[PDB]
Amino acid sequence: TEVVMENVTAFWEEGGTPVLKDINFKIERGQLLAVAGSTGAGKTSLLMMIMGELEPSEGKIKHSGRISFCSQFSWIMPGTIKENIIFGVSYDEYRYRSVIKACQLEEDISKFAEKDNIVLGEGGITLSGGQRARISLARAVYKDADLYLLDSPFGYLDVLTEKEIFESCVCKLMANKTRILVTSKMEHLKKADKILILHEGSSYFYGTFSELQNL
Ligand SMILES: Nc1ccn([C@@H]2O[C@H](COP(=O)(O)OP(=O)(O)OP(=O)(O)O)[C@@H](O)[C@H]2O)c(=O)n1
Ligand SMILES: [Mg+2]
């Protein structure tokens, strides 16, 4: 067992309404959990509990090891595209290349005269929303970790590009890794080992896509 929540209830504000209520799930090592639900349902808050920024008022939580987190809000720091993706981690050519390929960034990078040394975040290039999202995803995936927390990482991408990168990056490149993906897309829920649908803090559904189909 790699990540467990058992009867978890939590509050952002003392005496407030709970942001998560009686949440239950289990992820085995190397599995994929999809976390879905409407705005404000508590999906990012769930990831924050795993990262220790939100403590449970009821229930138990299990997780161990290093975390790599991809925010739903893409970001860039001043530096090259290579520096933004490696972001202080040791460099390896093969690992870097495999990530940028899985994230479709090789096409973008190949069009620049400076290639991977193009400078971002310093007033030169203005990246599109989808470029910034794929760079942010690549940064999180390049980091070596035991658990990957990918919070709606496909912002600004069209549905086919999102499908392709879900398959090449989250399913293929990351096949051996424990992953929690916040996402609402049907194919992602179908390919996940488990699905957790949140609604106003509560567990709307927890199980497999197959079990939901059977209902
Ligand atoms: N520091 C915080 C973070 C969140 N919240 C509240 O906790 C609820 C859930 O927030 P969040 O987990 O961020 O919702 P998401 O499910 O991630 O919504 P979205 O899809 O829009 O990202 C919201 O009512 C939000 O106002 C809060 O009070 N204080
Ligand atoms: Mg969120």
Side-chain angles (χ1 to χ4, degrees), residues 118-124 126-171 173-175 177-201:
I118 49 99
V119 174
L120 312 180
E122 294 175 23
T126 306
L127 301 164
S128 76
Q131 279 173 327
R132 298 168 44 93
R134 292 180 290 121
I135 292 160
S136 289
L137 174 61
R139 179 189 305 117
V141 167
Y142 184 85
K143 182 177 173 181
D144 188 47
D146 297 310
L147 173 66
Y148 291 85
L149 305 181
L150 308 176
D151 197 348
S152 308
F154 304 118
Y156 296 94
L157 305 177
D158 62 281
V159 292
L160 178 63
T161 297
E162 171 183 39
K163 164 189 181 68
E164 294 173 346
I165 295 175
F166 173 72
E167 293 174 6
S168 61
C169 184
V170 173
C171 291
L173 185 67
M174 299 176 76
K177 318 221 193 171
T178 311
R179 299 148 283 159
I180 303 188
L181 171 70
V182 170
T183 184
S184 297
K185 299 310 171 64
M186 190 181 292
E187 182 190 321
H188 311 177
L189 312 203
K190 180 187 182 181
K191 291 231 206 158
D193 297 282
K194 290 280 150 40
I195 299 161
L196 173 60
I197 307 178
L198 296 180
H199 178 73
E200 300 177 29

Side-chain angles (χ1 to χ4, degrees), residues 12 19 37-46 72 151-152:
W12 278 115
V19 61
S38 65
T39 183
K43 311 182 290 297
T44 301
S45 299
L46 185 157
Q72 79 192 76
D151 197 348
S152 308

